[PDB]
């Protein structure tokens, strides 16, 4: 019931990141959505309305249960998925204890009191918490910490999937643009859930993960990658998800490891969520003794792709392509990204 609203948020957040140009894209729409839905619990009317409206939400406000049900569906299970939300506030700054309880009971997030007066020490404590949560998967999440930081929200997610089809693999070229870099390329000839799309002008490949998730890979045609990203809708993907077919093909899928770091203040500010970041913010649910604003909001997403009588077509993902991970249970967009260069 919430996935059509969250899937539209995934595209509007992804398409906003294409403009902001030739870089690797990878983020978790559900993690960014749950982080700010969690943050909405400590906001007032005008400030609370922007967050939910900015997430494509008349809203029932049972979305927290739908987010909790999704988070509980993703709770540790059947796939190695590392996700967490860290709230870092400045010491002193009388906090509201009713907020810190719901942040851990509903969304399993943790709140910490740090000293932003020491910008180098505060950055170390935040990175070490994420490094502890990701266990070395994400190192040095925070690069720059502003001097006037009073409240920071960090959202991290790391994904290592288990292929239902175990997929040996060799090296190959990768054509970044009409440029040529090299990379390791996995290969497998057999029956795949693959077809072409006249509307999207792209190859559509579906491979399911052993953790009840399914990855959808979009290989655009010669020079129509921009047309693919503009034509992607939630209804088109549901049709591909409902598609049950099997065809023979020689698949070339690259083994990659891509990372995505984004400042959520800028990208969500262009999506209508600006009250929590402005000087007129109303975070009374977090602190009722002084005005408070969300200084920094950063999202980090890291992906690891690995192996877990007729001439067929060679479907080579040797050029930029768009991919999408869908949780088969809820049909939510778990991940969305675009691989321009696996070397970065």
């Amino acid at each position, epitope marked *: 019931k919430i996935t059509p609203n969250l899937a539209e948020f995934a595209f509007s957040l992804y398409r906003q990141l294409a403009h902001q140009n030739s870089t690797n894209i990878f983020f978790s729409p559900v993690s960014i959505a749950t982080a700010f839905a969690m943050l909405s619990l400590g906001t007032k009317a005008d400030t609370h309305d922007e967050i939910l409206e900015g997430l494509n939400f008349i809203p029932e406000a049972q979305i927290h249960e739908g987010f909790q049900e999704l988070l509980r569906t993703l709770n540790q299970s059947q796939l190695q998925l590392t996700t967490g939300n860290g709230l870092f506030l400045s010491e002193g700054l009388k906090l509201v204890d009713k907020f810190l309880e719901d942040v851990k009971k509903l969304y399993h997030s943790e709140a910490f009191t740090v000293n932003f007066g020491d910008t180098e020490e505060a950055k170390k404590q935040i990175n070490d918490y994420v490094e502890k949560g990701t266990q070395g998967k994400i190192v040095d999440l925070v690069k720059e910490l502003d001097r006037d930081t009073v409240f920071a929200l960090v959202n991290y997610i790391f994904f290592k999937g288990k292929w239902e089809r175990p997929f040996d693999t060799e090296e190959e070229d990768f054509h970044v643009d009409q440029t040529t870099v090299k990379v390791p390329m996995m*290969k497998r000839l057999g029956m795949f859930n693959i077809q072409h*799309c006249k509307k999207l002008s792209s190859w559509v490949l579906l491979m399911k993960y052993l953790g009840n998730a399914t990855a959808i890979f979009f290989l655009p045609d010669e020079g129509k990658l921009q047309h693919l990203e503009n034509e992607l809708t939630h209804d088109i993907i549901t049709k591909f998800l409902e598609n049950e077919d099997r*065809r023979s093909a020689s698949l070339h899928l690259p083994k990659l490891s891509i990372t995505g770091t984004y400042d959520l203040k800028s990208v969500l500010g262009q999506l209508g969520i600006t009250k929590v970041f402005s000087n007129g913010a109303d975070l009374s649910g977090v602190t009722e003794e002084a005005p408070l604003k969300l200084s920094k909001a950063v999202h980090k997403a890291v992906l690891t792709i690995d192996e877990k009588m007729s001439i067929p*077509p060679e479907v*080579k993902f040797n050029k930029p392509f768009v991919f999408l991970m869908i949780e088969q249970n809820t049909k939510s967009p778990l991940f969305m990204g675009k691989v321009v260069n696996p070397t970065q």
Partner: antibody, heavy 124, light 112 residues
């Protein structure tokens, strides 16, 4: 896009001959290549087909033992090594590029670009 | 092997008239809703040129006067206003199953 054949000539029955196909104007290592011969009766007969990387080769049973197709993507050249040649194999050998053209949820392999061809004569 | 039989062997068409070449396959060359039949044009001394792919789609730079049709095991190639440049050999070729096979060929000449 240009394809230039070479290596054809006169050979005795049972002899050997290696043909080359110089490619240019495109990424040769990204396209499927094929060999097609045309008998003196102007009849086209498919000879061999190799994938983009060279991992898969295809050929009919009439030439499965005598003809082998290979490619050197580093030199952008297609090769066809002929052995145990017979007089009936005398034909005009063309090399062409097989491009998979998408039409409706799938596509077909179509040899869209061809070379001028090289003449092979097998006689005593 | 899917054997391709063309009809007729030769055809004389006046300028501006209709040219129809048929191609019959021993087995079905359709798969996944699309047909694997291709048409090629070859003039003497020149290599063959891709004319029609997927049995009904015009190739790169092929004018609208070349038209392909058919489905299953029976296909046809249609050249409306017959021009002076169309005197050549025409072959149908299937790519549904290995080995790839060509038709016997059809010699199309201008009737004057």
């Amino acid at each position: 896009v240009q394809l230039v054949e070479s290596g054809g000539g006169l050979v005795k029955p049972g002899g050997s001959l290696k043909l080359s196909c110089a490619a240019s104007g495109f990424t040769f290592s990204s396209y499927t290549m094929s060999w097609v011969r045309q008998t003196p009766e102007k009849r086209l007969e498919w000879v061999a087909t190799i994938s983009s990387g060279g991992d898969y080769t295809y050929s009919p049973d009439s030439v499965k033992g005598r003809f082998t197709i290979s490619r050197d993507n580093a030199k952008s050249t297609l090769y066809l090594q002929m052995s145990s040649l017979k007089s009936e194999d005398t034909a005009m050998f063309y090399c062409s590029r097989a491009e998979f053209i998408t039409t409706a949820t799938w596509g077909v392999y179509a040899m869209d670009y061809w070379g001028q061809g090289t003449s092979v004569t097998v006689s005593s | 092997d899917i054997v391709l039989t063309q009809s007729p062997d030769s055809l004389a068409v006046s300028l501006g008239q209709r040219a129809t070449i048929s191609c019959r396959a021993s087995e079905s060359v359709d798969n996944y809703g699309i047909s694997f039949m291709n048409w090629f044009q070859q003039k003497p001394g020149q290599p063959p040129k891709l004319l029609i792919y997927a049995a009904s789609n015009q190739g790169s730079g092929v004018p609208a006067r070349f038209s392909g049709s058919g489905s299953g095991t029976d296909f046809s190639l249609n050249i409306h206003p017959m021009e002076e440049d169309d005197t050549a050999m025409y072959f149908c070729q299937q790519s549904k199953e290995v080995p790839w096979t060509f038709g016997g060929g059809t010699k199309l000449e201008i009737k004057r």
